[model samples]
Target: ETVPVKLKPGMDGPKVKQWPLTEEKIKALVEICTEMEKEGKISKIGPENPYNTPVFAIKKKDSTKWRKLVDFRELNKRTQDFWEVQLGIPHPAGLKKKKSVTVLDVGDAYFSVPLDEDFRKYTAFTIPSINNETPGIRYQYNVLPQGWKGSPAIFQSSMTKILEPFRKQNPDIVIYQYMDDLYVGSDLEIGQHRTKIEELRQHLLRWGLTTWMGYELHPDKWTVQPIVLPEKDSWTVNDIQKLVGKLNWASQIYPGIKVRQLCKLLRGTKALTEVIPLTEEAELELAENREILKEPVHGVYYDPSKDLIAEIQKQGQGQWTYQIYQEPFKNLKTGKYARTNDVKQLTEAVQKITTESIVIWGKTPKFKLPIQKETWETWWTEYWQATWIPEWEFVNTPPLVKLWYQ
Candidate 1:
């Protein structure tokens, strides 16, 4: 509903005679155009264009009817190989344990990107004899879509720009965007932590969509299985493949965990010549690694805010007073710390509130044997001028300093 607004002139090429639909198909299209217009995906051309492009309903299988895909086959030939085409879409075969998978998409993806004003003319069309309505009323789309020669590239270009900043900022939300089709490798925490395929299905089902994963997109919820899975697990060709990849991922997260042990189960079986079971050692080590991953690792978070009293709160003396000096987060694990939570400017911050600065607390240089720096005062002076306190060597004593103002 929020995507394309105006298509450009039709591609430069010959206009093929409009393709006709059967009686039933005609009715389907009548309903289709009615719905698309209501949904902001299509519109009537106030000033009609002479150009009329084809429309054919690509009948869907069973109850799987998708969308209004304009038959741009003729237009495609006109711009063949001239525009950029995405050759592949990335989908993970197997994912890591504990991470949840979620499929992301704009309900009607193709209709989301707006069309250019110029492109609308060439892409214009008129459907003849609408049930009892005006025959051949000219119509134009608000989106760069199905039948156009450069639709794929145009849509991709638009969508990438819209989503690139979000993706750049959220590295933890590993997502692969193929058009509007998103396969999240990590939990869609921002998606409200939803796990049901039904939630995704409800958003994706359209009149003319075709899904690659009638593997039913498989069980994204099967991200993690119990650790003590039986050694002699029942096997299937496809399950074995998925398991191998899953184990491969677990190795990277669980420090001591390795795939070689579990992979051995796979090597022995292709046609599944042998039934491979997990070893006791492999299971035990995996458990240990799982515990390790539980330890909060270093990751960053940020925000931007400053003191601004609410009118409601300002009515009376505010209860909460502001602190003069900012307090840093205490590092639960040593050497780690935290910083400000805002973007008034910018910076590095983490969960552990920062400890006092090393230089501020006490920066005394200790030379191993002889002095590294010529003088104690000189070394401290050098540190004060630095981006940070330099690691210089000095003795406990005169690494020297004079008494009074010396």
Candidate 2:
């Protein structure tokens, strides 16, 4: 029913020092530990332990109270990395097609599982003495600690097995299990949706894991959730990295986000701890991402029957931007498929210039058009000076010039 902490052979955890905290926080920590002790999640132990991990506390988001957290950084380094791979979580884009979602956040997810008695000593920690009133006490976890590297992996593996029947029963309803957060997506009618949720809840109840069910997991609402940015004027390299990671994830669901420049800022920074002032480019980038993520924007879906337009935007020397878009056009032979007449004229003009340019770069232009040295120089100047209009429309027919060039 439980799993033991697996460590690498001949490896001992580093002695991580506890982070110093105010007296108020220390008291809060002891109180929290006392509650956990009563729940049989943790226990008090003697003076010294060889493998002591540091413990700290932080203020909770909703209340003025602090939550106890064990710093398992040292122990995690020595822990085994081999764990089962879970592919249950679907792509972020998968949420777009779904109408409603029911999310079940498992309460005290890691604490539900008990740890082996002999291995509990490895998770020992000490609460440093607070003045004269509170003397230092050593304690160890009776269950898996939240900060351990393997907690999520172990919990997810067990959870996946527990929900096997639920998945098998309703294969039509898409379900995603991301550790403690279980997502069930549905486009079914209201009555069917409720039944589906209840069915899944009953499966979770069998294992005594489900808690905090809500419809806020609705895809439309989730997609529009505000992007959280740091309030400070400047940020650490590590902090910026987090922002980039979040934006990158959202950008995947919503295409056309310009994060390349924002990502570039993180490349040359020496350390994650290094402080950096945000440049104008980064500020501009953040503004764009914030604006785009503010509302739900529909993603593009391609239809195979439509005409696929592949357009190339010529950029600097030897560089071109390739973009493909599907357009609705029935007639393939008639030139009326051209959205604008000017685009057709520009296309022919550009074709002539491209063939002429190729002649200059390649062998003599003895083909269709004759290219002399003086004419090549004039056309070269025109090519660089040409102001490209991005409004050009694509015809239904395949581009013969591209194939001809190749």
Candidate 3:
């Protein structure tokens, strides 16, 4: 089955830059594109296509191999967001507690749904040239592209329809479908849980949904183990939001953790992208909240028979305290901390000292521009220079020499 790409009114073709890539990346990308054409996911197209977008390569999280992704942001902006159906994909917290669960990911979930023939040309992307001087080949997606905004809704609706009968038949088995991930769980025996998962897996296969092959599970898949941490020395509103989301997930697991302070800071923020200087209190709160998440904690389990204690103090007027405890927990000593991916330093990167002078073909003029040198220097020192890029250099070039160089 194919899906149509709807546009909001009269929309022109997207014109975007193709990001430059290394020679090795260009060779690998060529091979990958060849495979995509063979699999009928994409087709080579002439440069006459109206729509053109950039395609770039990124290293896989756990693997050394490179994978290509289309920069469809511009195209998506022009494309219509209109789509039918409510994607009732459950939240991670919605999964029932104390159940044997197995997760199965749908392989090439988006690619499985081919694009409408008429709209295929609108998804064209250019692979960057091996030599930066020359133009590269443009290819249009035969299948739905991964970065398309409408893909999830389309794929989810299709999968939901495919699983509708199975859901009705297996009422006791709880199945949660979030995008391409399908989580099947129940309070049934471990062996029986596996059996039911296999049954569902086979059923999905029968309906053309294949399990994700070689899908790498992230090392810090669980919310408790945060993959991205807030930048301690320099933090931004976006940084706080990132921590807020992760902490919110943890809060769902353990509501006792104090999250109101973090939320307060987040609520007070006007813009998420703006970088603000962190106050001492804010820094302390962020660190404390992060510790709360990192610490091994237990979820509350209710027991009706346990005694609850209440205390009232007369020293302070109208002061009362209530204490209720359920199960006792022993803190497990763990050596784990915030872990970063093992990214090696670039070989071409140079370490320069403050005394080093760099030559630039620019005139050394007075600070008379709209942005003064002093203002730029202060801003640079306050942000970039404090952490990285500590030095700046400028050189004057003669008019004739500059013209010739240009």
Candidate 4:
């Protein structure tokens, strides 16, 4: 009764087919479901229109733990399950200065939020019976289930409202929260070390959202800024294309199915340097101009040799990445170019730093802005330093940076 709406050009079938789970996979799933049940996050469902999303496991990048992800494509298309939350990717994850920082992670993040009873059926899944007389059992999630398209939005909105009171009362205290990751920091202690942090944590527990404080001195978020970003000099096409080819090749295994698996390990791992993940901005660039990057070394395309256009892109295009991104001053929403200390306004400006935006002369901060950020500016800066992105002969060649915006 249901099907894929878009077909692969040459593949001729669903990108995702029936995935039968192994015993290990099944055991892992049952364990997860049992825990969900114990937390009152899910319940058994009835038959007749039970929309069951299939589940599969993908190991975390460089980690042994495997998390289950459900295919929510069909469910997403048919449902209006979207809600707006002003989390603003990494909103304030990294600040210029700080006294003491309090980082709080919600235990079983989404489980803290209650899933409405009527909506549970849509999340139903059927587990084939194991040795018991019940050959088929249906279970659906109660709270916003992980891997659902809209759970983050729901959680963000709920959590924002819960923190609204603290927000008003303690305006001096800076806070950053995205989904379940909450951090409150301020230069002024008023018990800055551990006091207010505990208060906020307690207040969160008072709410329906299940949470706990594993507060630790984590300074990773501190390294997100500098007076100027890392240097990005001119780079040739071949430099970045190797990684591109690796991505298109690696994706041979991922087709239809929701949830990301097998986090591509091929990214510049050949070098002895530190391995950095691809940025949403870089991914956007690849997705946008990948057709041209396919230009050849021998032929007119990259289908065979990655070298042919390599020289031309570097020499002919003469592109610079500084052209691809805007200065930190330019905010996506407002032409108001000056910085006011009001973090609310600063956030309004830089929220553009980390989203997938169409490269009209390249660096407009964000594109569609449908996801999260470590710091709206970090990935692009790191990518520019690491990738030295080459402008495509066709895709990127035409735009004149000076004339791009005006």
Best by lDDT: 2
Model 2 stretches with alpha carbons more than 4 Å out:
56-66, 84-103, 107-109, 129-135, 173-180, 183-199, 210-406
Candidate 2 per-residue lDDT over residues 191-296, each given as its tens digit: 7888888878787778876541134344443222233455676788887887776766656555556777667788873699898888889888888876775554
Clashes of each: 29, 0, 0, 19
TM-score for each model:
0.35, 0.44, 0.47, 0.39
**Candidate 2: which pairs clash?**
none
Which of 1 and 2 is the better model by TM-score? 2
- Residue 207's lDDT within candidate 1 is 27
Model 3 lDDT at residue 163: 81
Instruction: At residue 97, give the lDDT of candidate 2.
Output: 54
Candidate 3: where are CA atoms >4 Å away?
Answer: 1-3, 10-13, 57-67, 73-80, 84-93, 96-103, 107-112, 172-180, 183-195, 212-337, 340-406
Best by TM-score: 3
Reference-based lDDT, each prediction: 0.40, 0.54, 0.50, 0.42
State in Å the error of residue 353, model 4: 13
Q: Measured by TM-score, how close is model 2 to the native structure?
A: 0.44
For lDDT, candidate 1 versus 4, the one ahead is: 4
